[model samples]
Target: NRSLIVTTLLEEPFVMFRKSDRTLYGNDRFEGYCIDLLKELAHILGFSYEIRLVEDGKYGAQDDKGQWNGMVKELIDHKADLAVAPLTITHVREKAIDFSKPFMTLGVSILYRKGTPIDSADDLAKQTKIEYGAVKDGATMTFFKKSKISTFEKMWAFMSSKPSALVKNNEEGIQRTLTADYALLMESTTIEYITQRNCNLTQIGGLIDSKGYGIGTPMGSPYRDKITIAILQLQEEDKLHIMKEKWWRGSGCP
Candidate 1:
């Protein structure tokens, strides 16, 4: 049997490099919630797989020219057989690829340094002292780009107005928050994980939108249904919860 090429991006508590002083190779090079889920999916589906990170380090987005980049493009181009990362299921993306049932649910939220005087996105939006943004070209960015709400509309204009406000990835956004007077909008699940580890950082508000993290496959691929069922089984069996606890149990802030 041929092994499937799984394209994923490194995201905290989902797909991250295994902390080690020794050299690691192949699948051993990665660990985290999604890695565990990927291994479980392979086991239930009876397939061997190879994991490769998306070269662009993006979740994927469509351009004005109707082109996709990142993991979505990799699937559309048939370079990857499966996408098992923190890829969100969205209306725009549904036209291009099939997503397995969401392995986990999350929503967009804001992250800022503690002791700031803001409690929500409105606070971030109606002020200029603390600049705020999300990962460029990510699902979070797309949400704001497509939002019709007046608050979000203005926030998008603020972000798009200054390219420097958008970051390449969550790590960069988090670092910028620490070093500069900035707030980063990101997935609530990740924000929770970050706040757990860093005493100086905190989520500024409730979720701005609701979504799920699903596995991606080419449209009409034979594995979609089976993989979806496997996810259902895992969810019913409570393994999903167990795995999340294992990775997300972080260093608590004092």
Candidate 2:
């Protein structure tokens, strides 16, 4: 294509709003990992592109009736040339849009206040009672709805036995868990960020499920191969890993 317009949701550390300017940051924002990676990719592939934030209420939230439709709607309706958000590669979403090769792989994990009576999934499993919350309408909630694992089933059994609440985003979950008797099940990467920001928070062991994040494009879009090639090259050159280390691992190397 002559031009590409990528739409992303503002999920912190992946995509976020600059608290100072209220300008969207992350991925395509200034000095963002995806921004830097895609810039290099554009130079290598000879493409002109623009990255725009998917305005709030566009998608990524619980719709009426407490369910989510996922964010593929933007691509399906031709509003976006591509999407580079943390769009998890799932069979349901795959039916609506095509995704490039996996860009990042992660899993769901539990986050609770540090020094809490929890250290691992086992600790959670053994708990008699606790409060927990997940994104009201998110990938994790969808997965949990159909999960079959005994551990998951048991957890559901317990959660169902009590009154639980839902939050719209990760920040809300972290905030609610701060002073309230609540735990959050969030993306592994996000949990890491929250834990770092609040030393009192800690992530438990064992992931909920292994998932891959991919750049999404409209079905049969011509840019699919190009983006795939760029991702492959970036991975091969260790550029992607370096970005992760710098951002998440606090590597001091320039």
Candidate 3:
């Protein structure tokens, strides 16, 4: 009768929200790579779980006052026992909570609607007319903050000055990229997932920053070592790779 509370966010290929009519009950209401991985983990760890979406649709970030919110806050407050999502492992986050060995590796990249003339960040830098953006307070923004390149610094400065140039989340950035002359800077894995499903969208340029996504638990949670073991075992067995192909690469895109 031990059931842990698991928190997740709705991100395609990782965790997707299924249409209401198709869902039955409990975790059956959703499906994707994370869902499958969660099932396997539960099997390996011999426990049950209840999956709930984070109250705020954010990966998680700290405010100017250093208050945590979103998934990280949920764990810090003991509101959830685990977080299984495409949550990136960054130095700031690591200091606040425990993480499993990375389950997947990724880097930041540009997402734009297909048929756009631009091919790289250089192309963006050359133009002042095309507006570009990244998720506010996310790792992509952090990449710009830590960048030493003059072009990147200038680009970030321009975007940060415009109220409309920063998005609250990736979905907003993606939507803006689709409907306007905008480019969304986001994780390469997510860009790959989006482009696979929407041929009209494409990723441009090499990665801007490299990182990994890990399962998050509260600092000193007893489950961290056990979950890390399960993750490592699945990785060695290629279950993680198989699941990625199943959810991401096989989504029926041309």
Candidate 4:
């Protein structure tokens, strides 16, 4: 690939729009943790990349017939050379795309209004009176949908029972929680960002499923191995944590 087409999405502290008065284009249009990581990866690999958001604006999840959507679809169809986003590495996804060593690690958790009596996934699962769900078609939703554990399976039933419980994205889910007695099931990393800035919101439980975020590539893409080692070099240099802190840290909620 002359210049890899890097597929990504707009995510806080990962890939984001810069607050510039003037319009920006190409790679200059974005900045954040993954943007910095891409810059370093490009430099290390001696290749330029054109970073573009995933057209579907989703992380990626497969449907009943094993058809995929979002970033994973881009890679599977070779529409993009690399997917550099907060894409979680899951067993079902591995079969369809290649992933570099995880650049970041996170887990599934619950976020909701501060006074909600929720304490864990089980708490939400057992009580249908309090609504709970995740972004529709997202990895978190996929997790619960595919989970065999009785608790998660039970929770999945509740969400499936009410289509309104599933939301379009994190922003929608977050706002829904504020508007009603609802809980948003999402990644813990994102909950960290939201809770710090919005004092009324809080994480309801510990992680339900731990996972890693990895750079994605088409099957057997030559750059996959290189990105893995590059990530390791950056990890040894403590660059990953520095990049994470640069974007994730925020003023106190109080």
Best by TM-score: 1
Instruction: At residue 161, give the lDDT of candidate 3.
Output: 81
Which structure is stronger by lDDT: 1 or 4? 1
* Greater-lDDT candidate between 2 and 4: 4
How well is each residue in 117-229 modelled by candidate 1, as lDDT tens digits? Answer: 68879887888888989998888999999999999998999998886899999999999999999999989889989999988999887999899999999988888898999
Superpose all Cα atoms of candidate 4 onto the true structure and report the RMSD in Å to 1 decimal. 1.2
Per-prediction TM-score to the true structure, in the order listed: 0.97, 0.82, 0.91, 0.96
lDDT of 4 by residue, 1-254 (tens): 49999999888768899888898888888998889999999999899999888888888888879899999999999999999998888888999998999998999999989985657789888777789999888889899988999999999999999979999878889999899999999898889989988999999989998999999999999999999999999999899988888888878687
**CA lDDT, every model vs. true structure:** 0.90, 0.71, 0.84, 0.90
Please report, as a residue range, the 10-residue window in candidate 4 with the lowest summed lDDT.
116-125
- Candidate 2 Cα errors over 4 Å, as ranges: 18-31, 56-70, 120-128, 154-164, 249-254
Output the lDDT of residue 199, model 2: 74
- Give the C-alpha miss distance for residue 114 in model 4, angstroms: 0.3
Off by over 4 Å in 3: 20-23, 251-254
Backbone clashes in model 4, listed as residue pairs: none
Best by lDDT: 1
Model 2 lDDT tens row, 79-180: 788887777777756767788998788899998876665666656666675677577666666566557876777666655465555676777778888878
Tell me how far the alpha carbon of residue 95 in candidate 4 is from the true structure, in angstroms, after superposition: 1.4
lDDT of 2: 0.71
